[PDB]
Design an enzyme around this catalytic site. Structure first.
Site, PDB file in Angstrom:
ATOM      1  N   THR A 105      12.495   7.698  30.053  1.00 55.67           N
ATOM      2  CA  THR A 105      12.298   6.711  28.977  1.00 55.67           C
ATOM      3  C   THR A 105      13.137   5.430  29.081  1.00 55.67           C
ATOM      4  O   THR A 105      13.948   5.083  28.174  1.00 55.67           O
ATOM      5  CB  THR A 105      12.499   7.332  27.624  1.00 55.67           C
ATOM      6  OG1 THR A 105      11.616   8.444  27.500  1.00 55.67           O
ATOM      7  CG2 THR A 105      12.168   6.326  26.551  1.00 55.67           C
ATOM      8  N   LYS A 108      11.963  -0.503  30.740  1.00 53.69           N
ATOM      9  CA  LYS A 108      11.316  -1.277  31.840  1.00 53.69           C
ATOM     10  C   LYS A 108      10.026  -0.604  32.340  1.00 53.69           C
ATOM     11  O   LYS A 108       9.060  -1.272  32.760  1.00 53.69           O
ATOM     12  CB  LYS A 108      12.253  -1.492  32.989  1.00 53.69           C
ATOM     13  N   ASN A 137       8.816   6.024  13.323  1.00 57.11           N
ATOM     14  CA  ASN A 137       8.931   5.745  14.749  1.00 57.11           C
ATOM     15  C   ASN A 137       9.589   4.395  15.013  1.00 57.11           C
ATOM     16  O   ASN A 137       8.923   3.430  15.387  1.00 57.11           O
ATOM     17  CB  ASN A 137       7.556   5.800  15.419  1.00 57.11           C
ATOM     18  CG  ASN A 137       7.647   5.841  16.932  1.00 57.11           C
ATOM     19  OD1 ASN A 137       8.739   5.828  17.501  1.00 57.11           O
ATOM     20  ND2 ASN A 137       6.495   5.890  17.592  1.00 57.11           N
ATOM     21  N   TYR A 144       7.701  -2.328  20.331  1.00 57.63           N
ATOM     22  CA  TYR A 144       6.553  -3.187  20.072  1.00 57.63           C
ATOM     23  C   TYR A 144       6.883  -4.606  19.694  1.00 57.63           C
ATOM     24  O   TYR A 144       6.351  -5.462  20.344  1.00 57.63           O
ATOM     25  CB  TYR A 144       5.498  -2.562  19.167  1.00 57.63           C
ATOM     26  CG  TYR A 144       4.820  -1.429  19.871  1.00 57.63           C
ATOM     27  CD1 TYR A 144       4.421  -1.566  21.194  1.00 57.63           C
ATOM     28  CD2 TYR A 144       4.526  -0.227  19.213  1.00 57.63           C
ATOM     29  CE1 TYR A 144       3.822  -0.530  21.863  1.00 57.63           C
ATOM     30  CE2 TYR A 144       3.924   0.806  19.874  1.00 57.63           C
ATOM     31  CZ  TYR A 144       3.602   0.647  21.208  1.00 57.63           C
ATOM     32  OH  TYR A 144       2.977   1.618  21.895  1.00 57.63           O
TER      33      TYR A 144
END
EC number: 2.3.1.57
Length: 165
Positions: A105, A108, A137, A144
């Site tokens: 995780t 990049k 989340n 995002y």
């Protein structure tokens, strides 16, 4: 450098040979997206219906045929470690899922998956991408916004987020 015990980390379209490894990896993308919400019972069940061999095969074929789905995998030396799946209707897209195994995780890689997904969508002409993100989340939400999406609305338990191109 990488810490992912592999000399190469790459992104390409899923092929029908990735099916079985994808099933395992999709099944977890789900237990994590909801480990803090649904019951053990319900999670073990819902994966059966959504990540069946036939539905995942339908989606890889449709991505492979340049139709309404785009399905890329991220691989560490030949091992599938993440993926991103999008639905493409006309000139819009919906980001259905994005996942990396915990052990890999690194923001990049997630960014590489999302980035290659946009390069392919530019060429197809998709001008807009929406996504749904559960409110708790925070890792996703953070990832995002940092990559260009804004909150457009809430759908009860989810932020609808958006990004135009």
């Amino acid at each position: 450098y990488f810490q992912s015990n592999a000399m190469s980390i790459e992104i390409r379209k899923l092929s029908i040979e990735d099916l079985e490894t994808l099933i395992e990896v999709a099944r977890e993308s789900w237990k994590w997206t909801y480990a803090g919400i649904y019951s053990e019972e319900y999670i073990e069940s819902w994966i059966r219906e959504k990540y069946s061999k036939e539905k995942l095969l339908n989606e890889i074929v449709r991505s492979q045929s340049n139709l309404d789905i785009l399905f890329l995998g991220a691989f560490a030396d030949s091992t599938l470690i993440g993926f991103i799946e999008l639905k493409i209707i006309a000139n819009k897209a919906e980001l259905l899922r994005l996942y990396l195994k915990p052990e890999y995780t690194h923001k990049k890689i997630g960014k590489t998956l999302l980035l290659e997904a946009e390069k392919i969508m530019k060429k197809k002409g998709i001008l807009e991408c929406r996504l749904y993100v559960h409110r708790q989340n925070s890792v996703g939400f953070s990832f995002y916004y940092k990559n260009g999406f804004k909150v457009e609305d809430t759908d009860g338990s989810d932020f609808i987020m958006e990004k135009k191109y």
